[PDB]
Amino acid sequence: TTTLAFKFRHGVIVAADSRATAGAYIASQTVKKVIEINPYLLGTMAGGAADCSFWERLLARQCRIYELRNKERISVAAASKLLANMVYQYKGMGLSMGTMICGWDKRGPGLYYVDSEGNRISGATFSVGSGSVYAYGVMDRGYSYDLEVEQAYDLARRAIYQATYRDAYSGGAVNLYHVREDGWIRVSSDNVADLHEKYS
């Protein structure tokens, strides 16, 4: 798995590969690792697939209850905190989860890293998963808060691509999302084999 996200002038970019593995067996090349929590909030999945899917689906349930009870959208801070408080109780029991909670609320673009070890942190850019080290290198050398929208899409796509190249455990397709002030949009799905053709 490789997933990344970053905040910039025009919101937050979110991207992932689509591979799943069981040991060295490739179990799938078509996994959706970006989950739609609501129309203005996405979660990303790295680590144990059942663990990420279950706990992010439960997060989605809780955010929706919150919205019905309070008559307003949950903030990115509060959503990431709910997730952290849920998993904290299970530390040491073998959950494996690394997620980015990505939205736009009253404080503007929002991005939090949350994991099964108990970490919860806000920041400008993150990458998570076995391929993250490779994605960080390319993302870091191209990132700017003032990236134009199309340049931001190019960077995210290229960083995941390069991770799929070096990391045996990442591959398939690169799926890209953009969180904007009025909601997230799905921007593209590009098979890594087609990107290979293009970048050479």
Partner: protein, 233 residues
């Protein structure tokens, strides 16, 4: 004085009968089911011009496809509404599908006779809920309106009024309802009826109105949209 689970000689639970009488102290609410959607309309019953009318909420969203109108002891309705919300979200979580209006109503109705003072937990429910509810929504059966009262009896209705003037309002509903009636006709009819039965002069701030349609999610009418419908009425 007798216990809360005592039957009368006619085979009714005193507490439930008394809770049903509390519904008559509530403001009037109306529900109408058409093939184009359901509408819910309720009298706010403003008691001072200093009160903020938007703080009276007698129609609530349960989920995107389900609304609920209430009458009686409104504070009692909060735990029922929250149970409805939690149940529809649980059903979504578990089954990845929307819960039917009938199923939501059933889940809530199973709370109804769960009161008493020597079966249950250290401070469980001491009495029934003094509330009646209209659940209006859309599922794969199409548009649907269900009524529930403090006995835990629930039933589908084509049109139904509850609260103080429900006799009255129910009679006018028999007169105007027809199976092929449009939603816009149903909306007008329910405001005409509220207008008759209300003690105050009806206007765009002392009523609430909501719809659910096959196309479209739960929608509370704004002041401006109520004013438009009020012109004809």
């Amino acid at each position: 004085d007798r216990g809360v689970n005592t039957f009368s000689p006619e085979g009714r639970l005193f507490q439930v009968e008394y809770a049903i009488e509390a519904i008559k102290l509530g403001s009037t609410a109306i529900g109408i089911q058409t093939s184009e959607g359901v509408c819910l309309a309720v009298e706010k019953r403003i008691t001072s011009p200093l009160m903020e009318p938007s703080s009276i909420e007698k129609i609530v969203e349960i989920d995107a496809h389900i609304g609920c109108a209430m009458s009686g002891l409104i504070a009692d309705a909060k735990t029922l509404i929250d149970k409805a919300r939690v149940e529809t979200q649980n059903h979504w979580f578990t089954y990845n599908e929307t819960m039917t209006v009938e199923s939501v109503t059933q889940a809530v109705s199973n709370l109804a006779l769960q009161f008493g003072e020597e079966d249950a937990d250290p401070g469980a429910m001491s009495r029934p809920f003094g509330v009646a509810l209209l659940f209006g929504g859309v599922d794969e059966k199409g548009p649907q309106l269900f009524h529930m009262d403090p006995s835990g009896t629930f039933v589908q209705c084509d049109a139904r009024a509850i609260g103080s003037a429900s006799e009255g309002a129910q009679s006018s509903l028999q007169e105007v309802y027809h199976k092929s009636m449009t939603l816009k006709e149903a909306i007008k009819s329910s405001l005409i009826i509220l207008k008759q039965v209300m003690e105050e002069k009806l206007n765009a701030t002392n009523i609430e109105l909501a719809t659910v349609q096959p196309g479209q999610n739960f929608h509370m009418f704004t002041k401006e949209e109520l004013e438009e419908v009020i012109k004809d009425i």
